């Protein structure tokens, strides 16, 4: 009726969306290699004839928290965590290359090296890494080199077979896709395998969700949500009062 | 007074737009760099520091801006409607228009290039410099101009604004027309 | 419409993409307490002007009925 009902409704609806965005981070505190999503609000003015008094606010995801996660020491050979900044190249079920930070690796019955989510890990050849089937000792190098020991072979047979593809692009050019894999915003952009990133083998990288940061965002989203609801109530209260004009 | 490292921090938004509207500042730090637009309208600033680099637009309407030092770089436009500037220096990197309406401007540097419109409305300027090239419209309404330079390039329409033109350029490539 | 001249509230969000050289991000200078007062004041002022117009509407009607 006054268009301030919808101006406040559109703000209250967006505050719920930001609340859900923060809720996903808290639901994913223990997730491995999880980058917390950032939430903010953007002011978009309604340009047109009349006084510039109506400005909408909509929530967006400007970026992600690319800080180093909490490293968990597991003493497992097939667990690796990226030191500092970096990524691991994996292809999902669609055969589409995407960057990940989950270094919880495993070997299937055929020998292909996958991660906890089943994404095949790429290597030097840019093809999924395949290991000889009857292994005896698998050690992951600090730079990503994979050295294996054939079954029954003596100690002095630690030959390298593959090198884990570690990619360190600009963090501002990466977006989180629909399946948690970060990809270039510009499509058809090759992932250059960096040789500077290092793996801290024997440990797993946790999530970087700042629990306090989400909680203080929640309490501010609640108060701003409630204040706009009062604006909706006072908008209809004014409308009801301004109805006796035609009540002759 | 002057602008310090922390004085400017209180007038900057998330996109580096410096707003000094009616602030009692008289000068800016030497070698000043502003990421975004700079607004110094209605300010007692008399001279811009040398080496000023603006990533946006300049607005100094109704201000005391009188002197600009050479080497200043402006990515956008320079809006000086109603300032106190008397002379325009040579070598200013300007990517927009130069609005000098209601200014005491008298002289302009030779071979000046303006990438947009040029407004010298109500200015005591006596003669446009030879080699002046304007990529937009020309406004000379209410000015003291009565003689045009021999060669000038106005990509837009020249607006006389009332003053009588006694001499026309010999080499003039005009993309528009001439209006009184 | 004229914007308030209060300084923008600077917050230390150094890891934010929009952070400046010092890690500060700036946020609107909206103060909750004064905006709530405007909500109360504008609504009560709006409703009392309807009362005057409604009362003034009656006075015109009684003038029409004057004399008969």
């Amino acid at each position: 009726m006054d268009r301030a009902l919808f101006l406040a409704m559109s703000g209250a609806k967006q505050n719920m969306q930001a609340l859900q965005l923060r809720a996903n981070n808290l639901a994913n505190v223990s997730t491995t290699g999880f980058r917390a999503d950032l939430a903010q609000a953007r002011s978009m003015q309604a340009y047109g004839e009349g006084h510039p008094s109506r400005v909408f606010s909509m929530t967006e995801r400007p970026g992600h928290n690319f800080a180093q996660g909490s490293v968990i020491t597991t003493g497992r050979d097939l667990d690796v965590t990226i030191e500092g900044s970096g990524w691991i190249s994996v292809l999902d079920h669609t055969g589409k290359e995407g960057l990940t930070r989950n270094g919880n690796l495993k070997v299937d019955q055929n020998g292909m090296l996958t991660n906890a989510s089943g994404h095949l890990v790429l290597g030097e050849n840019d093809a999924p890494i395949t290991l000889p089937i009857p292994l005896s000792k698998i050690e992951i190098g600090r730079d990503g080199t994979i050295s294996v020991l054939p079954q029954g072979a003596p100690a002095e047979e630690f030959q390298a077979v593959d090198r884990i593809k570690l990619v360190k692009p600009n963090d501002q050019s990466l977006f989180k896709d629909t399946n948690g894999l970060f990809r270039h915003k510009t499509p058809n952009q090759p992932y250059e395998a960096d040789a500077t990133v290092s793996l801290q083998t024997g440990a797993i990288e946790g999530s970087n969700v700042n629990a306090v940061g989400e909680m203080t965002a929640l309490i501010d989203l609640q108060r701003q949500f409630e204040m706009q609801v009062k604006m909706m109530s006072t908008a209809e209260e004014m409308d009801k009062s301004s109805d006796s004009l035609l009540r002759m | 007074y002057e602008l310090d490292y922390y004085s400017k921090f209180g007038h900057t938004d998330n996109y580096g737009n410096l707003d000094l509207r009616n602030k009692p500042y008289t000068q800016l730090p030497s070698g000043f760099v502003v990421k975004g637009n700079l607004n110094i309208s209605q300010t007692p600033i008399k001279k811009l520091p040398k080496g000023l680099d603006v990533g946006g637009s300049l607005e100094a309407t109704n201000s005391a801006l009188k002197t600009i030092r050479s080497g200043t770089k402006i990515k956008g436009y320079a809006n000086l409607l109603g300032s106190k500037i008397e002379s325009w220096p040579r070598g200013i990197k300007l990517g927009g228009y130069l609005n000098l309406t209601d200014t005491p401007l008298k002289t302009l540097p030779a071979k000046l290039r303006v990438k947009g419109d040029l407004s010298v409305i109500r200015t005591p300027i006596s003669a446009l410099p030879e080699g002046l090239v304007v990529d937009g419209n020309l406004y000379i309404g209410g000015s003291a101009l009565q003689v045009f330079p021999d060669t000038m390039t106005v990509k837009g329409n020249i607006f006389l604004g009332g003053n009588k033109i006694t001499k026309w350029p010999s080499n003039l490539t005009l993309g528009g027309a001439v209006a009184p | 419409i004229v914007e308030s001249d209060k300084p923008l509230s600077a917050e230390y969000n150094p890891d934010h993409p929009l952070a400046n050289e010092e890690g500060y991000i700036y946020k609107p200078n909206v103060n909750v307490m004064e905006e709530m007062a405007n909500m109360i004041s504008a609504s009560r002022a709006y409703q009392t002007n309807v009362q005057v117009a409604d009362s003034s509407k009656q006075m015109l009607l009684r003038t029409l009925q004057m004399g008969q």
Partner: peptide
């Protein structure tokens, strides 16, 4: 008119020479 009043039109800006130049 009031000084410093906001305008109801997009704010002519920098990128896209189009605005930096046209008055």
């Amino acid at each position: 008119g009031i000084p410093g009043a906001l305008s109801n039109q997009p704010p002519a800006d920098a990128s896209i020479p189009q605005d930096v130049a046209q008055m």
